[model samples]
Target: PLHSIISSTESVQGSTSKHEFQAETKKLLDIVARSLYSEKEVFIRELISNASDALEKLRHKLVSDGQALPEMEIHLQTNAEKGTITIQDTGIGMTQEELVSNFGVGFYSAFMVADRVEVYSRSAAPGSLGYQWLSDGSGVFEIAEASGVRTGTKIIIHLKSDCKEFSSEARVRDVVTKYSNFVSFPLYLNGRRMNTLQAIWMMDPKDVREWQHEEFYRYVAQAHDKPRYTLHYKTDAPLNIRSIFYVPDMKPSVALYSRKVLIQTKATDILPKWLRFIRGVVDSEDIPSALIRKLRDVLQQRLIKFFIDQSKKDAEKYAKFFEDYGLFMREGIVTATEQEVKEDIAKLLRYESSALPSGQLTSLSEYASRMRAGRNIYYLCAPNRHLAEHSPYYEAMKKKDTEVLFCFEQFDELTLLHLREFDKKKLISVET
Candidate 1:
């Protein structure tokens, strides 16, 4: 039997444990069963990742203690005899307290597809406990102190008859590699190892060069192409920012693609919105920490400083990035109370004007110096450069040969509305 019986009790604890998981665990599990269960295939990936994380933690502890295990491995078992699938790891076995605590934790996830579960575990250290926990995830579970278990953990899921497709080797193996490819330990299915990608995000910036950038871009971005530009950066000013951004050899728009090319391994909001075209790793210790407490990462000042630093370093391309993605900056101007930081974002916004021809984006400071000594830095908001110049509102400014900042997109109008003024000159719309 995949599950060891301490004394071969003919009656299995299928649904007879009296232990209740924590409230948070029960609630989340209920949510999984009701709402998130549809996405249950990803559970394999999640479990493998958690297993890898545990092993990585064990590895780190051993290194810190200056002595320990040669290797860590995850094992998988399938029971055709009992109509169940099991995943096991030989890293860190949980004690009774931890089992109780963690059981109530993500157990809700399996409630999506599981009617029952059997978890068996032992410890690496001698004389430790061998335990088995069984649950249907209905708030109540059974924990029996037993024996003949290996180190790490064993999760045996008796698949609901409808969800038996998950028991297929191909399906489970695909899910395992899809999400757990970067796990820092060996992942095995029926005792065969999987996932061979490196966790490049955890590497030192100084050592990771263009090739690593190219390789990682291909791996994470899932493209066969090289990066156009890479930003290897780490900061802790306004908010913590540790990111490696890459600009892919991408088309100008997503409109004309065959095979419905969609981006995989989502890199959403990893960089400033304007920095979307750039891609790489962004591991900010500050980002997630701030989001959880329902608080903003109070790093605007620091972020402004970072923008200044990066913009100064790569002014021309970033100047364009600012143009394409600057609307987000405009948003900050509207919401951010700090005057100095708002101005910094304002400085980064780029627009073409009468003073500059097509493909040239001028900064606000540059516009300020050349503004008519009398007029309140007149700007006409219209559909585009053509409409702004043609608008009746700009007739007087044109008659006076005074240059006007051309505000085209509605976003531009809204952003400028927030500032009201720059360099002590009020920004007013040329309203008709």
Candidate 2:
């Protein structure tokens, strides 16, 4: 009945004769299947990625040819009773020749998880006919004309007995959400839409409201509290960067993505280690490995510039951010190789000064600018403000009205050790 259901629809017009797959197709299919023994779920990723690519290409087609179609979408469904999973997309459909030549890697991926795969497709282009293509994971395939097919593509996978779990709707749903949730098109499973969150970084900042950022951060950071600050960064010049960085009010965890696809979650190195306190995403269309490194550098530079500008605009909020994440900056200074970045990172540093009030904080430049004619910049490394204020180190600098940058973190001494000096003035510690 399943065979009859497909056969009665139609058959391909040209090349009506069946064609066996080439020797090359056979070896590639075998390779994809064998490699998937370690990761069967990879087939699902490949298929979804392939579908997304199809939808994107169709969009380009509409742009160039000045022709069109309905909304672009990818749909996935599972049928446990028939032991089948079907994925459908309202994208550019393939002709008989294309159905054979163009589906090299993606088409073969399904073979690893299914015993049989059937494709039915109708052209989105006007006046073109439809066709159905079928293969049984062997070297042989069949293509026939199919009249009733919709203006898109649909693939029905007949699960192998050993892989019957994939036929369950719940299992299929999990796989879709895990790998392809952020794909740039609407994705539906059965009647429900899963990718409701938008990649707001791709949007213009003026169009985004505060509530929208709150909603997005909650989804990405999985936090109930709103962010302390949201930095929306976008550029299209020397490097294309579309990123949103969030400073959570509380202590944090972070993540990174590329073009809405999850590249790393709970990641640290993508941002400078000091930025481990940040939470949000980065998405670019052309981020290769070398460029990724440069992107990080560019992001760190942007953050420093942003902080300086923000500190002037909103001092109290920037102070709160510094209080929460300043230690990471100290770490950045210690490890940073580029002198300019180190100094820029240094601008974010804060200190308690003997010349200023007990709890007041000041920047290195601020302290450096007011120095007495011949005195070197002084600092004290101690466990607490009370100890630093009373220690032999602080008292010695106190007589000359010398300012001391207070150090509390265990790593502060090591950080300053690497910094050594700032703005041509030596950083002399009382202990040293």
Candidate 3:
């Protein structure tokens, strides 16, 4: 019944047949070619994605069925003189029935840039025959038996006069890099390999070594500096999420991926603005509003626990980290919506205190635990510890033998301004 609705048959001679596409299918093809894709160059990406799917399908079949498979790869060749681009894949090629029945909208995207398209494919099944399918984006198509065809699909696009730029290898390479560089299969353009970078985010986090992270971090962040912190996170419970986050030594830029294909180069929604200094990839099977919320919670919890552990195990390391990244923690305190979240972030903040020597830092919880008498945690903001110690506010606290926290950074006052109290003790700015 489906075939009767979608197919038209006309008798032909010698293993060849002509079919007229359903009228509705013809209209759909025209719409896809004209307006479905914003950029005409994405035709290359669409074709390659189809090739990848075929290869993946064959791989699964071979693995499950214990069959010998051909070398799997995608190849591209561009001929400027002939205004043609050829893409070939050694994958699970289609049979005649499949060739006709599996004609999909993605395959028809080639009509956007090509005047004529040709496909030659031979199924990988033993003793199977080959076929060639040809169409010019018209209502009619032809399929015929062929000899000596390989066990895969090969597509040749004869470019239209105005769309001949796709015939340039350089142009195609740029498109491939922008859209399909992280494809799971090996991709080649004119015998030169593209997609040299592996999708490391898809790999097991434990298997990835430090050197690999350094390399990947530089590539993803496009920076010369190594990542100060790397968070390789994977979870299956709430949602299937695999992510690699980097605390670069610079501003943040994150790349989002779905099944190893780049979705967005610089994703804005994955991290909050206060946490915008982080960089890396978040690869998920599903993208939803819940994804952002879950990712934020995971990162926040990990960050809080990481510092809490570091403070006890290695105080010097914690001090250095606090010095480098404490600004974000302060910003988090000001921007957090929940009072509990503000306190949790406040646990990571470290400030110099009169209870310890100069440059020795103390957290608000620590100061609260050690408080002698006052229900107030006093703090004075200045340009430096030396200025803070000599300030009039410190002189008054010294008379009462009260421990005072010293704030040195420009935003220290703003952070304390929002953090009015900690551990039930009012965070009193001496100026106030």
Candidate 4:
């Protein structure tokens, strides 16, 4: 039956060599079927990436060899009964030698999920012979000329009995949409085109339409509502970061991509916990998670400063947002190891104050500017404005005409306690 497909060790009828794999080849084979990557779905991704690379190489080859470039694409077919997933590409194909060498590591990754892998390819060069390469992930592989193959590549993966996940059309579709969504070519599962969403984060902000943002938000977030605030951010200097950060009305998750490939679904440490209410995608080439943490500091400082600059116009909305997510900022200030990051997060903090109207938030810099010269910043930690205004510390500061920032949220005073000072003004708590 289907078992015969993998049971083969024969020289092709016209060919002479019964090739025996070398020691390194066997080692690679073992590595694939056993433990190269913990994720079995990664095999689909690797093969797709390999196909894209082949197409790219073929693009340059066409220019040098004086020919028109073909419409390169990737397609996949899944058969549940046979437990086979076939990935075919209309890009470039490989020769017998190139197939064995180029596929040493990348192609064998198929063995991670499949018990048998077959490659049928016809090189694009003039009158080149078609070839088939077959391996059961063992010490021996079969490579020989085939007669009727087309001028591209087709890879057939016979999934292991336990590895039926890859054979499911839904799982295969998800793996493609997650990892290879922006793989620079049209990819199809069955006959339907995947990669439906364009890499909009890479486009200019001015050109992006409102509907496009909605579509992009829904695509990345799987949410129905439109984004409340859209940050189409891209920068090449300092470090290349291209991203679309969206503040949806609901809880938001940060989806991360590296060079157009999704790396992590719910990525952390790229933004402060304060901005965790944001959703969308980030596509950067070389920025590491560690570097993103540091960059989060820079972004926090800039965003806090920007909010302050616009505080007069957007105070109410700013206050409401703070009411929702300000605790994360307090956590950052308390937990920050670096003094500068603490101070930066501290600057964005809002408070009900004796000077400003109720429900309005003020900054430390604004409080300092409004205060009389040579006055230390005073603050009262209390349950509400009633307790804050009646506190003995507020009584002491009120006599001196010092504006005391009201701390209503739990642990606000402790965070300020950790900050110690802002704008060189010592933070004095009511109790302390």
Candidate 5:
């Protein structure tokens, strides 16, 4: 019998076909399947993102050129009885030939988790027949015209027994929610709506004020109390993107601290999980073809600019603000690829520590200039000054009389959790 049973464990990745991989591709594939990416679950997210992107591109074009677009949106449908999970989108569908090529070994990221993958797709051009791109993740995939298909594509993941989590309704919902919450379209989960994170980055600056900041602060930054600072920022940059990130109200927890790198996306759909407590605006209309990476850089710069903007914030107190929010910038450096961009933006970083206990803050460049000859970028994350002073991780720094940056914002607790170091120095999150 064809195995329809499903279970959960790590994935078993088969080698690509003889022609699909280059002569030395096995080693590269092994490395990618293991370590090139930080997290394993991100594979699911990456593939889904491609689907979302294709859809957005098609839909945006439709709206711009005034074409009659079907009610194309993103959604997930589950069939527990059949042990199947389907991620459907009204995006540009592929043809039978495309199914064999793209999803074969080049673009079929979903095969990382699924044992048998099936596709029901209709090409973007009118009159193109719908196709089923079916793969077992081995060397080859099959292609055939599917029945009763619409204009877009449908990815039916017949998940492997070892990776049944892909088929779980809850897990699928969470993955869809995390990576695609801000996609510029409606998302339905099992036929119900699921979009919650608002793209405030694309909104008018005048429309967002102190009040909305607090509301977003509570929901996005995962903060209580109120926003100590707010910046509603937008820009049409070299990369097209938009975002609203924030820094939460009070001091934060002792653990889970690190600066954001990239627009800190995580298992949580709410921006970067660390930034769940950091709030504000980051929008762009000119992101590159690769949306995710480019958008992160724009957001980091906008956030730093927001911190530096005298109208939204105070320059004199900018030092202190960086003391609490610099982790976000550190993340920018670690996650972003543009070297000069990170370095230039690094100059804008600010932090607080033993340098001045009166809540004074200093920039990374300023800290570098002041560092003793061999000193590195000393840093610590904690609940607050009191708890940080007591953290075991900071004991040696304190014993050495080092002036480590204190990240106390609630969002800071979750900063740099994935990023181990920055600027060639270790980034340790220790409470005092």
Candidate 6:
């Protein structure tokens, strides 16, 4: 027999034992069941997290004791007709005493959706006995000795009629991906494995190859194109952080994680609004406030140095980067309160010049180097180079034989308007 229950008023005649939850435990269970209806589906994540921890503990113990470890995984099987969901883990199972002592608050969350919960566990220790613990979320539970139990824990939740949605495989799989997708252990639904993508941010930067990043970027950004730049950063000083950032050749979207579990998919506050073009994952032991500041500084400095390096090393690539993402830099310059920050962003500015071919680009610093005592860095904002060159503005500068930058983008005029000056020279717009 799997489980047998005797009323609290009845006598126990067999090895099975009945126990009433303390008054507080019963009340808390009620509160969890009623108040947590909004997040009832989170029970799957909570239980899976518990299973992952248990498996990690067993793995640690085996490695420390120099014992041969078996396959470690968490498996879920859902039966819609039966309205039951079974989550089993090849983990460090509990002995009878441990089972009695180990009912956690997270365990009570199971009652949010489950009408009855049954756990059959056997310790990994060679001689430990197997036991079954059954609870109905009312006030009582039962524990009985069992045979043929595996050396791990298995939780079978009988879903309430209204919560039978959890017993569907599709629903459980979605929950797994949302919360436990990066859990270290293998997660399987029925016979198929999920969580195929490893949390690359958590790994040492040296260990990850370029190809892995290509795949990871596609997965995280859900884009077909590869990332133009990747930043894998790890630090342990003022804060513990492991993060990977990707310049995705597109818009910004970053996921935030703590200890490999996702907290937010599109974490807007992680970086400043100007950096909204960046995409990737940031995993830290902490979240919010100070951590955001640290991560922002790390990324901001890297971005500044990266653009500066690219411009010096490869002009063609830098021009392309500027073409695609220059608006962000312009926005940064406009919004920045500090002069140093504005000037740092100004270094990335690139525009075509009258001295160069129509399609060729030059930076403000390069234009400044050629100024030769000229007080103003001249530019003319127009729809195209032909129009800017043909306009009376260009006709005026023609007599002096001086070069003028051609600003083509619609926002280019606005950017130069806010930038005001670069390299100690005032940005003079011909239209001004």
**Residue 138 shift from truth in candidate 2, angstroms:** 4.6
Name the lDDT of candidate 4.
0.75
Who is ahead in lDDT, 1 or 6? 6
Per-residue CA lDDT of model 3 for 84-135, tens digit only, reads 9988888888988888876246788999999999788888777988888889
TM-score of 5: 0.55
Q: Which residues of candidate 2, in runs, are more than 4 Å off?
A: 1-38, 56-71, 103-107, 137-141, 236-240, 286-295, 332-344, 354-359, 365-367, 370-376, 381-414, 423-425, 430-432
TM-score of each: 0.66, 0.79, 0.77, 0.76, 0.55, 0.73
| Positional deviation of residue 93's Cα in model 3 after best superposition, in angstroms | 2.5
Ranking by TM-score: 2, 3, 4, 6, 1, 5
- 52-113: candidate 2 lDDT, tens digit per residue: 77788888889788875567888877788999888887777777678766533756888888
Candidate 2: what lDDT? 0.75
TM-score of 3: 0.77
Q: Each model's C-alpha lDDT?
A: 0.62, 0.75, 0.80, 0.75, 0.57, 0.80
Top candidate, metric TM-score? 2
Hey, what RMSD does candidate 3 come out at?
A: 6.9
Q: What is the C-alpha RMSD of each candidate to the true structure, in Å?
A: 8.0, 4.9, 6.9, 5.7, 13.5, 6.2
Which window of ten consecutive residues has the lowest lDDT sum in model 4?
1-10
**Ten-residue stretch with the least lDDT total in model 1:** 253-262
Regions more than 4 Å wrong, model 5: 1-40, 103-107, 202-211, 232-432
Error of 2 at 94 (Å): 2.0
Worst 10 residues of 5 by lDDT: 253-262
Whole-model lDDT, model 3: 0.80
Candidate 6: C-alpha RMSD to true structure equals 6.2
On residues 288-361, what C-alpha lDDT tens digit does candidate 5 reach at each position? Answer: 11335444545555655665564234655565555565666666556555555555555565556766664666
lDDT of 1 by residue, 1-432 (tens): 133212222233334346886788777778777775346775565556556666766677778888868558766555555666777777677787777667223345665667798877765555788788888867788887765576677777888878776777777887776656666676667656676766665567777777877887886566889865565555555545455556565533111111111113454433334334444554444321123221113323344555556666776776765755565677667766666656777876777777787657676776576665765766776777777767788776776767777877788877887887776777786673
Q: How many backbone clashes does candidate 6 have?
A: 0
